[PDB]
Design a protein around this ligand. Sequence first.
Ligand SMILES: Nc1ncnc2c1ncn2[C@@H]1O[C@H](COP(=O)(O)NCCc2c[nH]c3ccccc23)[C@@H](O)[C@@H]1O
Ligand SMILES: Nc1ncnc2c1ncn2[C@@H]1O[C@H](COP(=O)(O)NCCc2c[nH]c3ccccc23)[C@@H](O)[C@@H]1O
Lengths: 111, 111
Amino acid sequence: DTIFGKIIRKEIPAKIIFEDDRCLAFHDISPQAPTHFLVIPKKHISQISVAEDDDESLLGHLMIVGKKCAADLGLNKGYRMVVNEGSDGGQSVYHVNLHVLGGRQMHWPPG
Amino acid sequence: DTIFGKIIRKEIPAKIIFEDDRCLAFHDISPQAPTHFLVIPKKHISQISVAEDDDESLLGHLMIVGKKCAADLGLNKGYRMVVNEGSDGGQSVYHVNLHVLGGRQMHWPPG
Ligand SMILES: Nc1ncnc2c1ncn2[C@@H]1O[C@H](COP(=O)(O)NCCc2c[nH]c3ccccc23)[C@@H](O)[C@@H]1O
Ligand SMILES: Nc1ncnc2c1ncn2[C@@H]1O[C@H](COP(=O)(O)NCCc2c[nH]c3ccccc23)[C@@H](O)[C@@H]1O
């Protein structure tokens, strides 16, 4: 399975900042901002392009959890949420993952 | 209200590529990729940091609609989804909006 599959199954260790029945959040190993963490579903969805209609609430939950974690981490000046799909998106771990980045001005274009 | 509020109320014209009872999608006026469109809720939420828990399904719907529009627009090599919060996120229109960008390699960091 993927790296994130291994984190979910508790095969690879990770320092978590949030967990519930539906998702996990943890800091990125290669941070691109002073604050950079990930929110991932526990359900295996390899990429957002294959998410099903009934995954709507789960995907929204990732963003609500991202919002809450951002607040807890003191990102009061703002942040950026990112989901990458496939090669052009730069996906590297093929498990749906929401990036939340902040603590610096985020620029444009977003990559 | 905001620019997007005006688009929703059909005060400002916009060429739409998707509409339902909950959201609208349309191409960005200042595209940053060969394909760059936006998905916005019809409900007024000024920024993701003030989204409520019960907005989970709506937020997920934006991503599912983004996914579907991306497929329709032929983004088979991938894409990137982005939501900006506040000043550090680069928010400029204070109405929740999901960017979908593709048709080129998206780079890292994402801004
Ligand atoms: N054990 C662990 N704990 C915590 N974080 C972990 C981790 N193992 C891995 N990560 C992280 O997962 C993230 C996977 O995100 P992604 O959206 O699949 N690819 C985005 C990065 C990227 C790569 N190549 C690109 C090319 C062009 C654009 C972008 C890129 C990475 O930020 C980082 O590797
Ligand atoms: N009528 C119309 N039809 C179609 N698209 C329209 C439009 N009117 C406006 N837009 C678009 O809304 C988007 C608003 O996105 P945002 O996430 O609020 N800001 C991101 C851009 C940005 C700005 N400054 C920054 C600084 C640092 C990082 C980023 C930035 C813009 O891409 C573009 O202006």
